[PDB]
Amino acid sequence: MMISEDLRQKVLADAALGAGNVIHRLPLYGRSLDEEVLWLDGTWRAPDGSRPEVLTLGGLHEVVAEYAGFYTRAGVRAKDAVAIVSTSITDFALNLMALTGIGAIASLVNANMPAETRREYIRRQRVVGIMTREPWHADLLAHLDDDEPPLFVALQSEVEPGNREHRPAAYPFRHAPGDPILISHSSTGIPKSAFHTHETLFHGALSRLADGLDCSTRKRLLALPGHHVSAMSNTLLGLTLGAPVVHYTDPSGKAVLDGIEKHRPTIVFGFTHTFTEMAAEDLTDRDLTSVEAYYASHAVHIRRLLDKGYHTATGPDLKPKKVPGAIFIDMFGSTEMGYVLFDFVVIGRCIGRPMRFAQAAVVGEDGSVLPPGQVGRLGVRSKSLTPGFWNDNVRWHKQWLGGYFLTGDLAYRDAANTFYHLDRTTDAIRTEEGFVYSAYTEEVLLREYPEILDCTVVGLADEGVEFGWEDEGVATVYALVNLVEGAEAPQDPTAWINEALGRAGLPRVAGAAIVT
Amino acid sequence: MMISEDLRQKVLADAALGAGNVIHRLPLYGRSLDEEVLWLDGTWRAPDGSRPEVLTLGGLHEVVAEYAGFYTRAGVRAKDAVAIVSTSITDFALNLMALTGIGAIASLVNANMPAETRREYIRRQRVVGIMTREPWHADLLAHLDDDEPPLFVALQSEVEPGNREHRPAAYPFRHAPGDPILISHSSTTGIPKSAFHTHETLFHGALSRLADGLDCSTRKRLLALPGHHVSAMSNTLLGLTLGAPVVHYTDPSGKAVLDGIEKHRPTIVFGFTHTFTEMAAEDLTDRDLTSVEAYYASGHAVHIRRLLDKGYHTATGPDLKPKKVPGAIFIDMFGSTEMGYVLFDFVVIGRCIGRPMRFAQAAVVGEDGSVLPPGQVGRLGVRSKSLTPGFWNDNVRWHKQWLGGYFLTGDLAYRDAANTFYHLDRTTDAIRTEEGFVYSAYTEEVLLREYPEILDCTVVGLADEGVEFGWEDEGVATVYALVNLVEGAEAPQDPTAWINEALGRAGLPRVAGAAIV
Amino acid sequence: MMISEDLRQKVLADAALGAGNVIHRLPLYGRSLDEEVLWLDGTWRAPDGSRPEVLTLGGLHEVVAEYAGFYTRAGVRAKDAVAIVSTSITDFALNLMALTGIGAIASLVNANMPAETRREYIRRQRVVGIMTREPWHADLLAHLDDDEPPLFVALQSEVEPGNREHRPAAYPFRHAPGDPILISHSSTTGIPKSAFHTHETLFHGALSRLADGLDCSTRKRLLALPGHHVSAMSNTLLGLTLGAPVVHYTDPSGKAVLDGIEKHRPTIVFGFTHTFTEMAAEDLTDRDLTSVEAYYASGHAVHIRRLLDKGYHTATGPDLKPKKVPGAIFIDMFGSTEMGYVLFDFVVIGRCIGRPMRFAQAAVVGEDGSVLPPGQVGRLGVRSKSLTPGFWNDNVRWHKQWLGGYFLTGDLAYRDAANTFYHLDRTTDAIRTEEGFVYSAYTEEVLLREYPEILDCTVVGLADEGVEFGWEDEGVATVYALVNLVEGAEAPQDPTAWINEALGRAGLPRVAGAAIV
């Protein structure tokens, strides 16, 4: 159900609302401190030692104020960056809410980032503190020997009840639109460190709400990576709308299916791989009729889960009618681009059409906007984009071409500005017959041969040859094919592959081998 | 004389015009390639070995295209930074036109920056090249031993006639508004901040004023500004855009500029305070400075009246007709490399900096960001599209420079009810006392006005161990004054009582001690 | 005293706040319904028969809701216009709050508008109702015989206690920025122009200034402005927003305001020139006017110094601390019903109108729209979001009032190089002569400054048949002066030579003849 007109008018009348002060505006709109708003999976230990499964608005405020006080007593000040090294969406969400309340910046770091890469990633940021948990605390203490060391490398257990007494007198911070609120890492070398502001991380959300979109009170289950911007924006967005938010730290298809039955969410958020693992499960006696839509951020056999549900539609009598099948919405985005710049519900993976608050284009190597049906670099423009890379101006401006921000993908568009993903710019292979787009070739084979489970296209050339999109050398293409259990191998896989590539029109690979 | 309405309409209709492509739009407006546009003082050596004194639009285009070819052959590509270590306004301006022509960024480094600091300053930027001249090329080769070294550390002599053949085929580059074009450094302690400017930001204030019928004359302008300051580059590019003769002078000595004024008879003169003060110390009895109608000082100067009385300004007489009036105009330019060029219009208690220009906001801000009422001392802050979008490779220092949504200038100030702002001190120079806060620059300005026998004055805070007494702190301290007296001037008997006599007349906190130097 | 940072942040965060809903946002900011907010002079009769002298926020809400109920029962709906024919600032302000509460438009009609003109003026608007008082209700009933008649021509006495029950259920109305709220008329010849203002436009200048820390004090303000001018309505709504005590005075006689100043001791006083000139003609020897720090005159006045010397203003002393200083401030308000309230900041050759405020642009424009350089006479033009979006039901006259993208004020003017503007004449009053153009207001201002024995002066153009000699024309004419002299003043022998003696000193064109009146 869409939010009420009263809440709509209050939000659009609140020029101060943004990603840095969400929870503090809710009481002003009339929300009750006694109402439950956030549901936890039990893996988060509160300051008093509890493992709460639900928090009220008042309780969420208290938990966040305690963290805010600990940071202030510890020496964190407005405009400082603090590294949250964890894997829990609840860890990242609560720390973000507390650091924004004092004007500081939560640098979300995936604790699983390879050790020596995480060291360089964090070192470059010149954060003033590190907040983490016991599995990683011992290695993160190494940052105290950096040329510019942080002030502390602490544990969340150090946040004791009562620490909220150290929070600044002016709590909560009043953000300016351009005040930073978080930093996030890309998915390849040292990841990029894009930062977002009180305005950018909530710009698309607010634009969509104004258009009467993405503004329901529907219960949502967030199984996204806790460090991805998508996990944070949807947490804050749910709280603003008045929608029950449910945090799930476990991304396994089995925990989600259990959580779906447990909480009965009307919508579910996860990454593509998560729902896949759910598809290969029983799903026989699984009751998944509450879900109307899955939001995913590379898929097959999804209808396995969708047929288990129902979507509401408008009937010939202009009255609501329940229809078989839930919805699946692939969400195109990253940490830099913000949550979503494209709406989509076939040659290539259709990413959809640009949302109202964004511009998109396929761009040549010079920056020129290309005509439809020509393959080039996907580029985007939006206020929801990151304003830049933390302490990395060199790589930032080089990510822009022709005034567009390069997504890192190659694609083409039709004449209605519907875009179609073909590959990552890096993964494109040049041959003597033309360019081969690995992601697209893979999807074609997985379509023509249901017998294939996983598929990978690779180029190979003489030692020293460069055959990427930006290089000039040519290569020959080879297919490595995993087969499903029970599937019979093909006497000649190469010919087997090249038969599907031919009947579909694609070029042919010089070799193939069943790995299975 | 104001630019023609034809040129005004062409500029205001050119949505592509910005700081990265000025020279390339001029031919499109109808400018002749044979017209002289830029006058040089003779210290710049061209690729052909000549030391030109004037360049035509076509000439300048060639020189610039030669440099652009050199940079492209050498490996420089769009969005790369290239450090220009020099002291010459003409060096910086020509390299900036060349690098923007191919989409690169000209980092302007004042060669006289202390070597240890200049080494760390350039290293943090991660430039792909260094362009310099012999006096510094030797020491700058050290950067090739950095962990991320430049591809080259070249001399401007390496630019040879014919290098233009190597420039890219899409020359000149088409800039997006947000594409960077320039990097400049702040002004003595610590590593300078590196502020970058875009195609749009560096020309936003000039285009806004032009739209309002301001700062858009064809008047001859002599530029004796430090070549590495934004101000030198924006005023060069602005002049070429208006069709105003631009005159570059590398020598800031008051004598060289006084000679330059008599040689070129400029209508307006751009310099920093030091240059204009040296000029007023000359005889100026047989000097013809009548051509000058306005001195622009970006620099805290006195005796400028010696130079203004020698000039004239135009005004509207009681018959609503032009009338020549004794006295050249002096415009104090409040700004920095980060604040852009000028966000305040000015031409008393504290140094008046003026009112904000239409394209800028200004406020006096409390420690928590609150906007203070008129009459209260706080931190000066500003907002404007002509502001730098950030510090190069240094977000940590960038956001810390904003408070309550205002970019802090580093000054303490107050405003009156007309939003006229007055400068009192640098925030770091204020000293808290048991009486109240003592503002150095203002306290000096007071004692210097009362006693013309005082050349310099320096207040200093003295406190016990661990005692901090700055603006951001809570401790109090005792002020000691150190006063340099004029030549042969008679020293007082009780200097501490002498100082406190003037501080008492103004009601200012008194110093605990004072001593002549 | 400046408003608190808490209120500043609530206002600047309220994207719904505008001129159509001020009173309804105040309770949301935390304002008490029991606080007194609006002081009335006793000439307004409330629905309960009382003649209140003060209204609380809750009180005002009730009165307004009563009127709103009356209008809704009577048929008024959102987007309808309703003519308010009156002379009382309180009449207009209360009706405006009521009509915007239901989405309707308050057309403010100065009841003293000549009856033939007022009939045609109201008819063109096609209002669905007329609200007035007894002195004019009779003649206004004629409108019921129009081809498109109003549903009612009512008296304010018809508003009865309990009418509030009839107000819509969605009360109060939620305004979009572009929703109209008000219509006002221009100022003697022809049918006045009817300019309308929106939720946004009428508060754009006040919110912009507030954002800059200006025009946002809690100071008591006595409003003796004409009730039908926008200025009276914006300053009322602005005061209520700041939490500043507002005092409505319907009597503009200098004596009533002098009595009002002593009664309320306002910090700032709003009036038109006529009121302030009458005040300076009183004894003012035993009058306490020290409370007033600033007079705002929207009106060409002299002897205002008699009133300013009786007041004080606050300033920052040499110790950077507040200091009381003799002399109240006088602010000339340049503006109209179309230009909004004030687009120029001012507090000599021509009447100085000041510099443009940040939220406005100004130019001197040639006959083809070209922006003129400083020192040239042209048509004054302005751009601003606080401008009226158009003339009600009269696009034909609306677009003809724009030239070169600037809204023409109807004045001739010049500017200097600092974009300070000076008024010379109304465009229609300029007279071309074989010598050159003669500007009436300026020519008068000159002769009135030279000869204090001159009370009034009027230049007049004389030319042969078919000869046109205005600004927009090409003919020349002979100027004849008509001079009213002070009481008992001695008439000159050669008045024509007397006048031409002063015109000659200033280099102005001389008159062909002159005669005392």
PDB file of N, CA and C in Angstrom, chain A residues 77-80 105 124-127 148 170 174 176 178-180 195 366 388-395 397-398 400-403, chain B residues 78-81 105 124-126 128 176 178-180 196 368 370 383 390-397 399-405:
ATOM      1  N   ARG A  77      35.082  13.620  15.398  1.00  0.00           N
ATOM      2  CA  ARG A  77      34.452  14.920  15.238  1.00  0.00           C
ATOM      3  C   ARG A  77      33.814  15.018  13.857  1.00  0.00           C
ATOM      4  N   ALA A  78      32.997  16.053  13.683  1.00  0.00           N
ATOM      5  CA  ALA A  78      32.331  16.278  12.410  1.00  0.00           C
ATOM      6  C   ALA A  78      33.345  16.285  11.275  1.00  0.00           C
ATOM      7  N   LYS A  79      32.980  15.635  10.171  1.00  0.00           N
ATOM      8  CA  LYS A  79      33.755  15.560   8.937  1.00  0.00           C
ATOM      9  C   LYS A  79      34.903  14.561   9.024  1.00  0.00           C
ATOM     10  N   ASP A  80      35.015  13.800  10.111  1.00  0.00           N
ATOM     11  CA  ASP A  80      35.987  12.718  10.195  1.00  0.00           C
ATOM     12  C   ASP A  80      35.409  11.448   9.579  1.00  0.00           C
ATOM     13  N   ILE A 105      31.687  10.348   9.057  1.00  0.00           N
ATOM     14  CA  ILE A 105      31.508   9.605   7.814  1.00  0.00           C
ATOM     15  C   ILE A 105      31.829   8.140   8.081  1.00  0.00           C
ATOM     16  N   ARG A 124      44.845   4.444   2.716  1.00  0.00           N
ATOM     17  CA  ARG A 124      44.691   5.603   1.844  1.00  0.00           C
ATOM     18  C   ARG A 124      43.642   6.576   2.365  1.00  0.00           C
ATOM     19  N   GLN A 125      42.624   6.072   3.062  1.00  0.00           N
ATOM     20  CA  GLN A 125      41.497   6.911   3.447  1.00  0.00           C
ATOM     21  C   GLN A 125      41.843   7.880   4.566  1.00  0.00           C
ATOM     22  N   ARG A 126      42.888   7.597   5.341  1.00  0.00           N
ATOM     23  CA  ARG A 126      43.281   8.439   6.469  1.00  0.00           C
ATOM     24  C   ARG A 126      42.114   8.633   7.437  1.00  0.00           C
ATOM     25  N   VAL A 127      41.451   7.523   7.771  1.00  0.00           N
ATOM     26  CA  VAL A 127      40.378   7.565   8.756  1.00  0.00           C
ATOM     27  C   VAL A 127      40.954   7.856  10.138  1.00  0.00           C
ATOM     28  N   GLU A 148      50.177   7.643   9.076  1.00  0.00           N
ATOM     29  CA  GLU A 148      49.078   8.409   9.658  1.00  0.00           C
ATOM     30  C   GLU A 148      48.125   7.415  10.311  1.00  0.00           C
ATOM     31  N   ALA A 170      24.806  19.449  20.790  1.00  0.00           N
ATOM     32  CA  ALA A 170      24.016  19.783  19.614  1.00  0.00           C
ATOM     33  C   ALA A 170      23.499  18.553  18.871  1.00  0.00           C
ATOM     34  N   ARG A 174      23.090  18.721  12.169  1.00  0.00           N
ATOM     35  CA  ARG A 174      22.265  19.276  11.097  1.00  0.00           C
ATOM     36  C   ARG A 174      23.113  19.296   9.830  1.00  0.00           C
ATOM     37  N   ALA A 176      24.350  19.749   5.975  1.00  0.00           N
ATOM     38  CA  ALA A 176      24.192  20.441   4.712  1.00  0.00           C
ATOM     39  C   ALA A 176      24.075  19.410   3.591  1.00  0.00           C
ATOM     40  N   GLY A 178      25.542  18.791   0.858  1.00  0.00           N
ATOM     41  CA  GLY A 178      26.796  18.237   0.404  1.00  0.00           C
ATOM     42  C   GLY A 178      27.671  17.631   1.473  1.00  0.00           C
ATOM     43  N   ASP A 179      27.201  17.572   2.710  1.00  0.00           N
ATOM     44  CA  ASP A 179      27.999  16.980   3.780  1.00  0.00           C
ATOM     45  C   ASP A 179      28.102  15.473   3.571  1.00  0.00           C
ATOM     46  N   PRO A 180      29.305  14.898   3.584  1.00  0.00           N
ATOM     47  CA  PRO A 180      29.421  13.449   3.380  1.00  0.00           C
ATOM     48  C   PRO A 180      28.873  12.670   4.563  1.00  0.00           C
ATOM     49  N   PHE A 195      32.343   8.237  -2.208  1.00  0.00           N
ATOM     50  CA  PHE A 195      31.605   8.743  -1.060  1.00  0.00           C
ATOM     51  C   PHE A 195      30.270   9.323  -1.506  1.00  0.00           C
ATOM     52  N   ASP A 366      35.644   8.796 -28.060  1.00  0.00           N
ATOM     53  CA  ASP A 366      35.866  10.233 -27.987  1.00  0.00           C
ATOM     54  C   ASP A 366      34.946  10.928 -26.993  1.00  0.00           C
ATOM     55  N   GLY A 388      32.486  11.945  -5.810  1.00  0.00           N
ATOM     56  CA  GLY A 388      33.872  11.675  -6.131  1.00  0.00           C
ATOM     57  C   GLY A 388      34.435  10.501  -5.357  1.00  0.00           C
ATOM     58  N   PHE A 389      35.707  10.219  -5.647  1.00  0.00           N
ATOM     59  CA  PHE A 389      36.462   9.166  -4.978  1.00  0.00           C
ATOM     60  C   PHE A 389      37.291   9.786  -3.857  1.00  0.00           C
ATOM     61  N   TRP A 390      37.114   9.281  -2.640  1.00  0.00           N
ATOM     62  CA  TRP A 390      37.871   9.752  -1.487  1.00  0.00           C
ATOM     63  C   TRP A 390      39.369   9.762  -1.767  1.00  0.00           C
ATOM     64  N   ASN A 391      39.981  10.937  -1.621  1.00  0.00           N
ATOM     65  CA  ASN A 391      41.426  11.129  -1.754  1.00  0.00           C
ATOM     66  C   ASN A 391      41.980  10.583  -3.068  1.00  0.00           C
ATOM     67  N   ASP A 392      41.132  10.406  -4.089  1.00  0.00           N
ATOM     68  CA  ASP A 392      41.558   9.809  -5.352  1.00  0.00           C
ATOM     69  C   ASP A 392      40.951  10.595  -6.518  1.00  0.00           C
ATOM     70  N   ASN A 393      41.443  11.819  -6.716  1.00  0.00           N
ATOM     71  CA  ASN A 393      40.983  12.615  -7.849  1.00  0.00           C
ATOM     72  C   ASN A 393      41.525  12.078  -9.167  1.00  0.00           C
ATOM     73  N   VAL A 394      42.670  11.390  -9.137  1.00  0.00           N
ATOM     74  CA  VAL A 394      43.284  10.916 -10.375  1.00  0.00           C
ATOM     75  C   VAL A 394      42.369   9.918 -11.076  1.00  0.00           C
ATOM     76  N   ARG A 395      41.903   8.903 -10.346  1.00  0.00           N
ATOM     77  CA  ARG A 395      41.043   7.890 -10.948  1.00  0.00           C
ATOM     78  C   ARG A 395      39.620   8.384 -11.177  1.00  0.00           C
ATOM     79  N   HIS A 397      38.269  11.595 -12.284  1.00  0.00           N
ATOM     80  CA  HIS A 397      38.012  12.286 -13.543  1.00  0.00           C
ATOM     81  C   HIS A 397      38.257  11.377 -14.740  1.00  0.00           C
ATOM     82  N   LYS A 398      39.175  10.417 -14.615  1.00  0.00           N
ATOM     83  CA  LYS A 398      39.413   9.468 -15.698  1.00  0.00           C
ATOM     84  C   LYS A 398      38.262   8.486 -15.874  1.00  0.00           C
ATOM     85  N   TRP A 400      35.250   9.599 -16.218  1.00  0.00           N
ATOM     86  CA  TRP A 400      34.282  10.374 -16.981  1.00  0.00           C
ATOM     87  C   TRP A 400      34.769  10.544 -18.414  1.00  0.00           C
ATOM     88  N   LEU A 401      33.840  10.437 -19.362  1.00  0.00           N
ATOM     89  CA  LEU A 401      34.154  10.583 -20.781  1.00  0.00           C
ATOM     90  C   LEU A 401      32.971  11.255 -21.461  1.00  0.00           C
ATOM     91  N   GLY A 402      33.226  12.377 -22.129  1.00  0.00           N
ATOM     92  CA  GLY A 402      32.161  13.100 -22.794  1.00  0.00           C
ATOM     93  C   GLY A 402      31.138  13.714 -21.869  1.00  0.00           C
ATOM     94  N   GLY A 403      31.498  13.950 -20.609  1.00  0.00           N
ATOM     95  CA  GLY A 403      30.566  14.465 -19.631  1.00  0.00           C
ATOM     96  C   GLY A 403      29.718  13.418 -18.951  1.00  0.00           C
TER      97      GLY A 403
ATOM     98  N   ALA B  78      43.996  13.087 -21.847  1.00  0.00           N
ATOM     99  CA  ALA B  78      42.914  13.795 -21.178  1.00  0.00           C
ATOM    100  C   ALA B  78      42.802  13.352 -19.725  1.00  0.00           C
ATOM    101  N   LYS B  79      42.476  14.305 -18.852  1.00  0.00           N
ATOM    102  CA  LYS B  79      42.250  14.110 -17.425  1.00  0.00           C
ATOM    103  C   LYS B  79      43.536  13.895 -16.641  1.00  0.00           C
ATOM    104  N   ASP B  80      44.697  13.916 -17.288  1.00  0.00           N
ATOM    105  CA  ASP B  80      45.954  13.831 -16.564  1.00  0.00           C
ATOM    106  C   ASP B  80      46.340  15.202 -16.020  1.00  0.00           C
ATOM    107  N   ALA B  81      47.109  15.191 -14.938  1.00  0.00           N
ATOM    108  CA  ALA B  81      47.669  16.401 -14.358  1.00  0.00           C
ATOM    109  C   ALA B  81      49.140  16.520 -14.735  1.00  0.00           C
ATOM    110  N   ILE B 105      45.256  18.693 -17.127  1.00  0.00           N
ATOM    111  CA  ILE B 105      45.124  19.621 -16.011  1.00  0.00           C
ATOM    112  C   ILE B 105      46.487  20.234 -15.722  1.00  0.00           C
ATOM    113  N   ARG B 124      52.114  14.272  -3.765  1.00  0.00           N
ATOM    114  CA  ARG B 124      50.748  13.904  -3.409  1.00  0.00           C
ATOM    115  C   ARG B 124      49.797  13.988  -4.595  1.00  0.00           C
ATOM    116  N   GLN B 125      50.120  14.802  -5.599  1.00  0.00           N
ATOM    117  CA  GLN B 125      49.219  15.014  -6.724  1.00  0.00           C
ATOM    118  C   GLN B 125      49.251  13.877  -7.733  1.00  0.00           C
ATOM    119  N   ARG B 126      50.350  13.125  -7.798  1.00  0.00           N
ATOM    120  CA  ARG B 126      50.474  11.999  -8.722  1.00  0.00           C
ATOM    121  C   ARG B 126      50.325  12.470 -10.169  1.00  0.00           C
ATOM    122  N   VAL B 128      51.449  13.110 -14.095  1.00  0.00           N
ATOM    123  CA  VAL B 128      52.119  12.297 -15.101  1.00  0.00           C
ATOM    124  C   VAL B 128      53.259  13.039 -15.789  1.00  0.00           C
ATOM    125  N   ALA B 176      33.464  19.221 -20.862  1.00  0.00           N
ATOM    126  CA  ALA B 176      32.245  19.240 -20.072  1.00  0.00           C
ATOM    127  C   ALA B 176      32.406  20.252 -18.944  1.00  0.00           C
ATOM    128  N   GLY B 178      32.138  20.151 -15.770  1.00  0.00           N
ATOM    129  CA  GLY B 178      32.858  19.649 -14.622  1.00  0.00           C
ATOM    130  C   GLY B 178      34.246  19.120 -14.890  1.00  0.00           C
ATOM    131  N   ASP B 179      34.716  19.161 -16.130  1.00  0.00           N
ATOM    132  CA  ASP B 179      36.063  18.683 -16.423  1.00  0.00           C
ATOM    133  C   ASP B 179      37.086  19.586 -15.743  1.00  0.00           C
ATOM    134  N   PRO B 180      38.075  19.031 -15.040  1.00  0.00           N
ATOM    135  CA  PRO B 180      39.098  19.883 -14.428  1.00  0.00           C
ATOM    136  C   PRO B 180      40.018  20.499 -15.466  1.00  0.00           C
ATOM    137  N   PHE B 196      41.523  22.470  -7.065  1.00  0.00           N
ATOM    138  CA  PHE B 196      41.352  22.358  -8.506  1.00  0.00           C
ATOM    139  C   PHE B 196      40.099  23.102  -8.947  1.00  0.00           C
ATOM    140  N   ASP B 368      29.291  26.248  15.874  1.00  0.00           N
ATOM    141  CA  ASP B 368      28.440  25.131  15.482  1.00  0.00           C
ATOM    142  C   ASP B 368      27.814  25.315  14.104  1.00  0.00           C
ATOM    143  N   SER B 370      26.033  28.066  13.198  1.00  0.00           N
ATOM    144  CA  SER B 370      24.942  29.030  13.246  1.00  0.00           C
ATOM    145  C   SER B 370      25.358  30.349  12.607  1.00  0.00           C
ATOM    146  N   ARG B 383      29.624  30.741   0.093  1.00  0.00           N
ATOM    147  CA  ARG B 383      29.115  29.749  -0.842  1.00  0.00           C
ATOM    148  C   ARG B 383      29.116  30.359  -2.238  1.00  0.00           C
ATOM    149  N   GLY B 390      36.876  20.984  -4.832  1.00  0.00           N
ATOM    150  CA  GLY B 390      37.530  20.178  -3.816  1.00  0.00           C
ATOM    151  C   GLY B 390      39.034  20.321  -3.868  1.00  0.00           C
ATOM    152  N   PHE B 391      39.680  19.692  -2.885  1.00  0.00           N
ATOM    153  CA  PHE B 391      41.133  19.604  -2.836  1.00  0.00           C
ATOM    154  C   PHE B 391      41.584  18.342  -3.567  1.00  0.00           C
ATOM    155  N   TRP B 392      42.592  18.485  -4.422  1.00  0.00           N
ATOM    156  CA  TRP B 392      43.098  17.363  -5.203  1.00  0.00           C
ATOM    157  C   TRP B 392      43.666  16.280  -4.290  1.00  0.00           C
ATOM    158  N   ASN B 393      43.066  15.090  -4.350  1.00  0.00           N
ATOM    159  CA  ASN B 393      43.556  13.909  -3.633  1.00  0.00           C
ATOM    160  C   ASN B 393      43.525  14.087  -2.117  1.00  0.00           C
ATOM    161  N   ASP B 394      42.646  14.962  -1.612  1.00  0.00           N
ATOM    162  CA  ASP B 394      42.679  15.301  -0.198  1.00  0.00           C
ATOM    163  C   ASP B 394      41.268  15.674   0.272  1.00  0.00           C
ATOM    164  N   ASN B 395      40.372  14.684   0.249  1.00  0.00           N
ATOM    165  CA  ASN B 395      39.031  14.903   0.778  1.00  0.00           C
ATOM    166  C   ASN B 395      39.054  15.130   2.284  1.00  0.00           C
ATOM    167  N   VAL B 396      40.043  14.563   2.978  1.00  0.00           N
ATOM    168  CA  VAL B 396      40.076  14.645   4.436  1.00  0.00           C
ATOM    169  C   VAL B 396      40.165  16.097   4.884  1.00  0.00           C
ATOM    170  N   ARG B 397      41.048  16.873   4.254  1.00  0.00           N
ATOM    171  CA  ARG B 397      41.151  18.293   4.566  1.00  0.00           C
ATOM    172  C   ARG B 397      40.040  19.120   3.928  1.00  0.00           C
ATOM    173  N   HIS B 399      36.528  18.546   3.384  1.00  0.00           N
ATOM    174  CA  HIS B 399      35.255  18.683   4.084  1.00  0.00           C
ATOM    175  C   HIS B 399      35.429  19.334   5.450  1.00  0.00           C
ATOM    176  N   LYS B 400      36.589  19.150   6.084  1.00  0.00           N
ATOM    177  CA  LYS B 400      36.849  19.798   7.365  1.00  0.00           C
ATOM    178  C   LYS B 400      36.875  21.315   7.240  1.00  0.00           C
ATOM    179  N   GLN B 401      36.984  21.835   6.022  1.00  0.00           N
ATOM    180  CA  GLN B 401      37.013  23.269   5.776  1.00  0.00           C
ATOM    181  C   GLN B 401      35.618  23.863   5.623  1.00  0.00           C
ATOM    182  N   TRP B 402      34.568  23.052   5.746  1.00  0.00           N
ATOM    183  CA  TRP B 402      33.192  23.523   5.667  1.00  0.00           C
ATOM    184  C   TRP B 402      32.537  23.448   7.040  1.00  0.00           C
ATOM    185  N   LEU B 403      31.716  24.448   7.346  1.00  0.00           N
ATOM    186  CA  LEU B 403      31.024  24.534   8.626  1.00  0.00           C
ATOM    187  C   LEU B 403      29.665  25.172   8.383  1.00  0.00           C
ATOM    188  N   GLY B 404      28.607  24.498   8.825  1.00  0.00           N
ATOM    189  CA  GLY B 404      27.263  25.001   8.605  1.00  0.00           C
ATOM    190  C   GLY B 404      26.919  25.220   7.149  1.00  0.00           C
ATOM    191  N   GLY B 405      27.551  24.476   6.244  1.00  0.00           N
ATOM    192  CA  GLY B 405      27.325  24.644   4.827  1.00  0.00           C
ATOM    193  C   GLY B 405      28.096  25.773   4.182  1.00  0.00           C
TER     194      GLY B 405
END
